[PDB]
Amino acid sequence: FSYLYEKIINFRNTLYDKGFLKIKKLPVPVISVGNLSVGGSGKTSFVMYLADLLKDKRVCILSRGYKRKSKGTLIVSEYGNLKVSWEEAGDEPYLMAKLLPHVSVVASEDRYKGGLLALEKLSPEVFILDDGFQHRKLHRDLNILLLKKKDLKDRLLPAGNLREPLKEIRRADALVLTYQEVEPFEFFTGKPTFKMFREFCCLLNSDFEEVPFDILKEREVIAFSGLGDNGQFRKVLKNLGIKVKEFMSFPDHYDYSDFTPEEGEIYLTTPKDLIKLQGYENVFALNFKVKLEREEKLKKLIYRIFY
Ligand SMILES: Nc1ncnc2c1ncn2[C@@H]1O[C@H](COP(=O)(O)OP(=O)(O)O)[C@@H](O)[C@H]1O
Ligand SMILES: [Cl-]
Ligand SMILES: [Mg+2]
């Protein structure tokens, strides 16, 4: 079937290419972050990295809200003020909202509408589209595309993980090449291109406070995650030399409703999972900083949108 999903996608894109479908424009600058495949690609992390670059602007992130308990357009946080449970928001928007005390977050299937409500209520100076590469109906002033090595040899859904053919790389203004710290790769296209690394430096307790890895020594952990790809987390742990006695691989966006930790055991998971387990005392998350090659170049490129 990957050949008529593909027909549909190609058709859709041609329509947008030729100007047969409406592209709408918000009255402030819009940066899109997205990728080409299902299965995680550093999008959420990159969006948080980006919001941080723009710390001197009023920033609003526009997200779709992936499997949440709420409908329509929803304000998740107002410049840091959380306003819904993580269930109501979707885990990614909530995580962003939580780790970015200075940013607003809006969840909306129709991103343009989300932007309008945000303008009305938050007067942001810049929008970041969380996962907005395929949402061509909303105009973006800077279209950033994340690629991981794996995408390069993947194929269209349902056969493979690609939501669109690799040729659609042409729609990007800038490419970000992710997971360099675990799957390095090069990719030259003549477009502005930036390698993204994750520096795994820190450990969080379940109240989102930094703690030394000191608790991990000469202790084997039970690790788990519910991510786009649990495999890369599992590998990061091995590369870090963290002793992992067991690994539980949960579905992306897993709700942990039936999760009950065993007494005396220590659990290691990600911030994306941890938001759903706040207060469980023996559960920790591996945390990291995002670092971009040629950050200075990315900045000049980003600030062009304000002129
Ligand atoms: N190797 C990892 N180490 C720590 N946290 C991770 C790791 N991989 C993913 N995460 C968590 O999951 C979030 C990203 O979700 P994921 O499903 O990997 O991809 P995407 O952002 O493309 O949806 C990150 O912000 C981080 O909180
Ligand atoms: Cl990530
Ligand atoms: Mg995701």
From Swiss-Prot:
Binding site for ATP: 37-44
Documented EC number(s): 2.7.1.130
Pfam families in UniProt: LpxK
Recorded GO MF terms: ATP binding; tetraacyldisaccharide 4'-kinase activity
Top enzyme category: transferase
Keyword terms of this UniProt record: ATP-binding, Kinase, Lipid A biosynthesis, Lipid biosynthesis, Lipid metabolism, Nucleotide-binding, Transferase
Protein known as: Tetraacyldisaccharide 4'-kinase
Species the sequence originates in: Aquifex aeolicus (strain VF5)
Record's catalysed reaction(s): a lipid A disaccharide + ATP = a lipid IVA + ADP + H(+)
